Design a protein around this ligand. Structure first.
Ligand SMILES: Nc1nc(O)c2nc(CNc3ccc(C(=O)O)cc3)cnc2n1
Ligand SMILES: Nc1nc(O)c2nc(CNc3ccc(C(=O)O)cc3)cnc2n1
Lengths: 275, 263
């Protein structure tokens, strides 16, 4: 299993660590962003995820001009200084288009190209696209998350969105699937998805997961956001043992170390996965 | 449903337990360190008065009794926690039981003259560990070893319901042997006995990551999660708090799974 973008490839026979580079200001961003990316690359991240719109519960929307200002210079600088792959965490067709031009490898849209023109703009780049499940939108998703059967519903959603991208001329082989931990889900919904994650392999597509420092850990352990490293590594290991291909994290070094132990364990397994 | 009974209490192995490592005014400090590990969430404390590392210094009976017995006794009196004792000597097994120890954790699987009978006398749970690097099929050797020791114990009057099995990570085993047993750990459930593992800070992590003994936390956690996801019942560690947290995540995952195990 491999992805192709920007005249290079990514080999997904072993788990990759995707380092989070949030570039939403809180009350020199370009230089600090590149310093941060550098540490993460040295720590072993093989993909950096650049995000200019907070997608957290309750988050406010960001204008296209502001998102571009935050994201595009950062993507460019990384693409010319380093060789690491670059995912852009955006829903906006103009950010998708512009990101690609300055060297982005993966469109990582939490809205799965649901915005006007997103689907065509992503098709136009030819880049790999990650489709994520979210119930509702970031402003209201955590109000009252509800499923009769969360796995079945997320699974159906992936069927529908794969089709949607196929119809738009994006081939199955470009797609990644992310069950969207924390995006319109309570505690038990998240753990049901984590527990049954290997069953999403039936699509024969790369799985991407992001649980780092999330409330599914915070609420379970009753610890604050800075106190979640051990819990984050447990979630990472659990996902990667079930054949998850990309692990989106804040703490790169520690995750990279944990993924080696997982790689050593899987290569000594006969069938290369846990279920 | 699994359960162990000792010293009038019981250990419920429906979820994974963290066993904290305690190496033996040193009595006051041992009790301080027991206290911190309990606070961190260890439900078993493993006490050793002969360091069971390969090549460590052998001690006499008198010396081991003098080190271990006071500490076991102190912990038994002050705390509710279970107490594992790392010993191979019948006298230490015998005296440890008298002062409240719950588990005889013998890395030599009761091979020393008299250890088997002393263990049987106590009525206590016994952990059988594999030890000896060269094997055709490391899993099958360890598995064959367990069938043999289970029989040897049963023969001496120790019921199956008392036994725990430990494949002995890092004991006469190179990197690839260790990862083979870890990868196949779930297969040891055919015995229907508790599984205890101890990989914390070992060279199977140090060599893989190329870091020193104080920098192996993440890999140690990775090993614990890997074992616990396979239904391992007791995890032996240095870093109690971090392992307990990781086990909580594993427990939430296993609870949402129809199978209660990964294979
Ligand atoms: N592909 C992808 N996959 C994710 O999982 C993700 N998460 C965020 C961050 N958003 C969240 C959501 C929930 C939580 C919480 O529950 O705590 C925290 C942060 C941003 N981009 C993402 N992209
Ligand atoms: N039941 C049980 N199970 C163990 O795994 C264990 N380990 C030790 C500690 N011994 C070792 C062995 C090897 C290594 C290394 O390779 O580095 C480190 C420590 C002591 N008692 C133990 N008891």
């Amino acid at each position: 299993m491999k992805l192709f973008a920007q005249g290079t490839s990514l080999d997904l026979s072993h788990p990759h660590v995707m380092g989070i580079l949030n570039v939403t200001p809180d009350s020199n961003s370009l230089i600090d962003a590149v310093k941060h990316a550098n540490l993460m690359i040295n720590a072993g991240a093989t993909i950096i995820d650049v995000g200019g719109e907070s997608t957290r519960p309750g988050a406010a929307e960001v204008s296209v001009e502001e998102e571009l200002q935050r994201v595009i210079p950062v993507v460019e600088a990384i693409a010319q200084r380093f060789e690491v792959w670059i995912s852009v965490d955006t829903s906006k067709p103009e950010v998708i288009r512009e990101s690609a031009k300055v060297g982005a490898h993966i469109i990582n849209d939490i809205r799965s190209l649901s915005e006007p023109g997103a689907l065509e703009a992503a098709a136009e780049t030819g880049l790999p696209v990650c489709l994520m499940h979210m119930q509702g939108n970031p402003k209201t998703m955590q109000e009252a998350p509800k499923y009769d059967d969360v796995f079945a519903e997320v699974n159906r959603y992936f069927i529908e969105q794969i089709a949607r991208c196929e119809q738009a001329g994006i081939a199955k082989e470009k797609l990644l699937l992310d069950p969207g931990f924390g995006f319109g889900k309570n505690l038990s919904h998240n753990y049901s998805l984590l527990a049954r994650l290997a069953e999403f392999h039936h699509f024969n597509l790369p799985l991407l997961v992001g649980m780092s420092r999330k409330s599914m850990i915070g609420q379970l352990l009753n610890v604050g956001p800075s106190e979640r490293l051990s819990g984050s590594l447990a979630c990472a290991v659990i996902a990667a043992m079930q054949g998850a291909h990309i692990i989106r994290v804040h703490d790169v070094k520690e995750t990279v170390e944990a993924m080696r132990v997982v790689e050593a364990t899987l290569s000594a397994k006969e069938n290369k996965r846990y279920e």
